[PDB]
Symmetry: C2
């Protein structure tokens, strides 16, 4: 009674109209929850899909809608629900042709290629929670990436409005009919073809390397197999990358999560720290691509090693608040060559300089590790080693400080002016920020920055706790010194 | 995998109003179907639950309704749907207190036990089907056992009427609300205490035997573990029970109304086990005037065994429902069926379970080996040597859609040979010798062999059952003449 109960609740459970916490909370990662908590039910999908069908035009999407779903249990029912209402709105929905699952970056690609050649722009709906065992509903506009706050805010309001009026305003069609309406689309077909213009597939097939790829039960199965059998890639499809280390008997092994927007890198030395791989990937990228006037994008809590890698390569960084959405415009327009988070997510531009995928691409990042080892005659983790030695070795850590429901609110109002220590673990504070250096947008929480270490602290949008991040290029002892002062300072301000 | 699809289709799919094959088909086994074929969907459950809610009064049930579900995926949502509807009608619904699943026999006991101490009689609803791909909805009246044809026919029409009118007449509650109104009931608890009134548990406890029990991922998991615990029974809970490191092993199907017996010699043929059980039962219980119940297709060894003990046989059409009344009123101490399903009376002549009880039969197999000092299969061997060894064959003959209709019109007149496999035909029947009700099909009886032919209710098939006490080669002659006779009559 776990999975069967899980799907029965999706349909049998409904959110409490009077409980703001069970309604549609469309954020940076779309709407997420679980039927076990009544936070992700048929009710939620009907409202969000209805809302998107109504606001779609205003968002500038008049063409087809690319529908996808990952391997999460609740995604199955969601896909059915969404498809059913959209089809009832006459919108041309495009569903997976080969298989039933479509990784997030493939939808991103399908939208981009479409709007680059058609007037009636397309958008996309991805039913994926990211990842334990909960549902997710994400929207990607004609930009082909995570929707911005204006669009999410508008979806959320309408969804809750419909929900609040009992859904009497939702139009639906029976699955059977909707399905007869849907138009099959070869997502992977398009992927295998175009990815060749972002990654040197040639250099990989002639590398003599033995690359392993574990779809980890995710949705990247079909695309990996087709990438291998369509470019003659030396990669074995053997069904982040949790426990892919099972067999370090490959020259390199790639892993992807359910919607494959994230990646894990394994080598004989083991599983790479996400931040460390980004560092290496970044160096390899800006060392082989010609991206005139293209900055390096990253979130405020992303490793500063990327910062040091960019400087060493005469490249400028564009720091933003957490949320891959802040990179979308930058990638879509070409001024961001590489964009990544510390959460094992990233993407970069094709050679051309044009965008490949505006959302996080776990597949592209996996292929790159292969290309990196190929062209450089050096493993990715060994590249990180060379980077750490020359530019500085980062020590990252993060902790959560439980906070009283009242202090949690005080944290929300906290700003740079209230957090101004002259020192950080023995170093002169160079900056205190409450806005992202790249776009100047507020970043929710503050960041204290020193020459070799920095720390940030932001409120948890779910539970009453403060999320503190800290990094240092001076060692574990120093890193603890930073966390202590961070914690300390943090409580003084929330007192 | 295909399982999330199976459950999603339970809700996203519905039966076509213009196609009778997808409507409610409440037979002897209740309603069975699959969402993958729009034959078992929320529409179906909503319609049946609503039908039963409106008809319970006329069926004589004005008390609690015992709800239960097995381990079939489609049983989960069906439980939710049924509970919601029943709750909306103010019906007091009893649900599984321990674990989430509950075996058919355990519901039967609860009804019987309740109706023997209250005036507002109780009934039950079990959500169970068959393969993992489908589910079912069964109803057990105040009798405690499978509903008869009258009730079943009433449920079917009302349910299809609702479906035809889009379910406009279906009222329900949100699961959560219905769930709050649900009264938890400890099924296994009542079973563990009362079973000691039907089988000699002390004998098993002291037997020194090592028994193995394989619930097979079914709903009987809890009751078994609790039986071993509350009685000191040498039962180890774990038909692939093919891992004979026990003196005796037991298997049960999902809803536990069927049993499978395993000994170092292998898996006992269902019919054979029934023979052994029947003998041990009548050479051990004192059931004054209690006849032996069996279906027209169940092995004749049972007839011989009953004859050897001076007991009358009461043969009926297929369908355990034909034994309910007899078990309920005491005139039949044992009721068995070739499909590995049986039940019997309590030591004192009172009903224990009026429906098939794979747990009872399983416990009985151990009591048998404990009290007799011989395995169930060694007993069957002795009965076969003394009264005659049976050879049973089953065979489905696919028939054109046209013959399927002629088959349904076939009677004793059309199938009347003078001899069967070189033996004089004693009687040709199209009625059951016990009650006298049509057995739907025909049966040809010789002194040492017989064969029956009946229409499958689900597909264009004529089912042929043949048995001979003369060996393999002779069985082959019985089948052949049988299929030959069948084709000719359906030409």
């Amino acid at each position: 009674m776990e999975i069967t109960r899980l799907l029965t609740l999706y349909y049998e459970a409904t959110p409490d109209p009077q409980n703001p916490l069970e309604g549609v909370r469309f954020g940076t990662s779309g709407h997420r929850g679980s039927s076990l908590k009544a936070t992700f039910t048929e009710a939620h999908v009907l409202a969000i899909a209805q809302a998107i069908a109504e606001l779609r035009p205003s968002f500038g999407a008049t063409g087809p809608l690319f529908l996808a779903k990952d391997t999460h249990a609740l995604s199955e029912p969601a896909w059915a629900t969404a498809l059913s209402v959209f089809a009832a709105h006459g919108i041309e929905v495009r569903v997976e042709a080969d298989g039933d699952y479509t990784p997030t970056p493939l939808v991103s690609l399908a939208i981009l290629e479409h709007n680059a050649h058609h007037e009636a722009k397309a958008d996309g709906v991805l039913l994926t929670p990211s990842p334990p065992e909960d549902g997710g509903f994400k929207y990607n506009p004609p930009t082909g990436g995570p929707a911005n706050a204006r669009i999410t805010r508008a979806i959320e309001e309408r969804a809750n409005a419909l929900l609040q009026e009992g859904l009497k305003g939702v139009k639906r069609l029976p699955l059977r009919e909707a399905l007869a309406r849907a138009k099959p689309f070869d997502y992977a077909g398009l992927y295998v073809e175009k990815v060749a213009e972002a990654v040197d597939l040639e250099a990989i097939r002639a590398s003599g390397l033995r690359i392993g790829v574990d779809p980890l039960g995710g949705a990247s199965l079909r695309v990996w197999e087709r990438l291998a059998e369509s470019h003659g890639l030396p990669l074995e499809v053997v069904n982040m990358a949790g426990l892919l280390a099972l067999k370090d008997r490959f020259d390199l092994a790639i892993g992807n999560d359910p919607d494959a927007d994230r990646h894990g890198i394994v080598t004989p030395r083991g599983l790479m720290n996400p931040n460390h791989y980004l560092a290496a990937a970044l160096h390899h990228l800006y060392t082989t691509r010609s991206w005139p006037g293209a900055k390096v994008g990253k979130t405020a809590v992303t490793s500063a090693l990327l910062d040091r890698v960019a400087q060493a390569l005469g490249r400028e960084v564009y720091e933003t608040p957490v949320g891959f959405k802040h990179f979308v415009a930058g990638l879509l327009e070409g001024w961001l060559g590489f964009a990544g988070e510390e959460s094992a997510g990233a993407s970069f531009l094709r050679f051309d300089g044009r965008p490949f995928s505006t959302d996080k691409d776990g597949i592209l990042m996996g292929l790159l590790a292969a290309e990196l080892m190929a062209k450089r005659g050096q493993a990715p983790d060994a590249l990180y080693e060379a980077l750490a030695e020359k530019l500085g070795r980062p020590y990252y850590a993060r902790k959560d400080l439980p906070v009283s429901p009242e202090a949690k609110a005080r944290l929300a109002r906290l700003s740079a002016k209230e957090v101004h220590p002259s020192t950080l673990a023995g170093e002169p504070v160079l900056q205190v920020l409450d806005r992202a250096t790249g776009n100047g947008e507020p970043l929710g929480g503050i960041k204290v920055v020193a020459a070799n270490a920095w720390f940030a602290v932001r409120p948890s949008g779910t539970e009453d706790v403060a999320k503190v991040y800290a990094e240092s290029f001076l060692g574990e002892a120093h890193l603890e010194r930073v966390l202590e002062e961070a914690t300390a300072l943090l409580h003084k301000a929330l007192a």
